[PDB]
């Protein structure tokens, strides 16, 4: 029984956290075989954030420059690259502790799990989700820049995120392991809009669902909806469009609590339109957006 | 910057989960050293669960009736033994991945992270809290029995909770690594009664505090409050009753943010009397009592 915020085992992510050093800067790194990856900005001072040319930066260091410490060994960089905004410092030892790994990038509302670091020891993990205007709402410090966020998928741990910079206002942004920044954000010092952010509505329907088969069943209502006006209802709750293939998503919990997806959508109008007047769906005064259908799939089974 | 719920990282946990098969019973078991621990009602069938008199079973059972797998290896019991209600099964092969580890009780209202497990492979982490009425708030399947609780302090992880059953109520109860079950529940099928859980006022004014080192500060309140007739109001919205001594818990998070402790139970006391009126400190409409002020410290450093 039970349904809770829940992450994957960082076991075979742990084993891959080192700590980059490039003079002053000190942040981890992703040792995955014989490469290191870094957010590039390690090269930048506290000045040089603010107007970054990190092609004349990267001219200026060298390959002895970098200090890759995996826990206290040492590894040498043997070349310095720059993959869009990451660096992959190549090393000499390769690391035997490499799980099956994959480079994958996120759409916007899925869920994934980051192993926060400090100094390349990790120092704790919880599960975010990619909010849709691209931001995640997590805990990072001045020493988390590096940490992945990874869902691990059978055997294969698929990194999919590494945390880049705070934001001024309040939330964090980061890249892909490629290179590639989510979103409208930029690896420099100046003010960055992140934008509106809206609620997942595929996520909190599935949130709902969890709900009917742990007890929670008072936001239950006779009424149905279509899926057409509900979103005339969502849209004006910035709540995201619910499509078609995201009713195809929610089958599987349709199937098991017997509750039809758009029974669901009707439920869901009611809490908007007339709140929640104070309750405890599995434990929460609002409306939970960061849960993927496939969250409730593998933990309500 | 950033806060929420964060647990220790798991794979120092993960090299000690093994599944243990009695016959048509498969749960998790704790590997270290060279004894396993696995919770002892894996020597009851179905209708055993009801009236067990484990003296006896245990009887009845040999020690290759143990079936002991870790991944895709094999341990011989030895020896079975049961210390009060869990099971410590001597085995041939040392774990060479056991960590430094001591078995730790933990006191009501402290919080710890739980590794999630099914047929020993671990599935996911989260952290839960000790609840006062010595119960627990998780998600455990059918599987979950045997899955651990710890706090890893330094390089030493102390291994506090062992999941046991699955209360009529829909939450959790456990022991700790030694035997001895938390609260008033032994491990049968009878109408176990958890009690009225009341909520950590240690742990929300800590919470509190982390509201201001991130930005929440609509709670605070020009006030001030005594100590005595703080809880004259708390005991009737069934919080524990603030001590002295957690006054100066919470010594560190006044000095950090200039907010008396004091002054913090007059916000809260507030909180309670008229209500939050709908508003997000930190992210939820209700106050969050599974945060102990070493959480708050040790993640909003």
Redo the contacts between chains.
Sequence with gaps: ????????????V??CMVQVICGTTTLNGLWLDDVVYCPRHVICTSEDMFNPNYEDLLIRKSNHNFLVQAGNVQLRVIGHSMQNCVLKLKVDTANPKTPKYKFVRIQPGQTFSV??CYNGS?????QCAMRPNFTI?????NGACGSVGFNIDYDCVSFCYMHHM?LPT?V?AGTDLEGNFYGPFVDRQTAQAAGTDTTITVNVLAWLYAAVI??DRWFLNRFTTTLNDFNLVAMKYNYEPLTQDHVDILGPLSAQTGIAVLDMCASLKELLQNGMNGR?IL????LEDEFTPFDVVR?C?
Tied chains: 1, 2.
Excluded: D
Aim: aromatic residues 10%; positive net charge.
């Design positions: 029984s039970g349904f809770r915020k829940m992450a994957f085992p960082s076991g075979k742990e084993g192993l926060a990790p120092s704790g993990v919880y709402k997590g805990s990072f410090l705070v309040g964090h742990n007890g405890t434990g929460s005064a609002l933990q089974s």
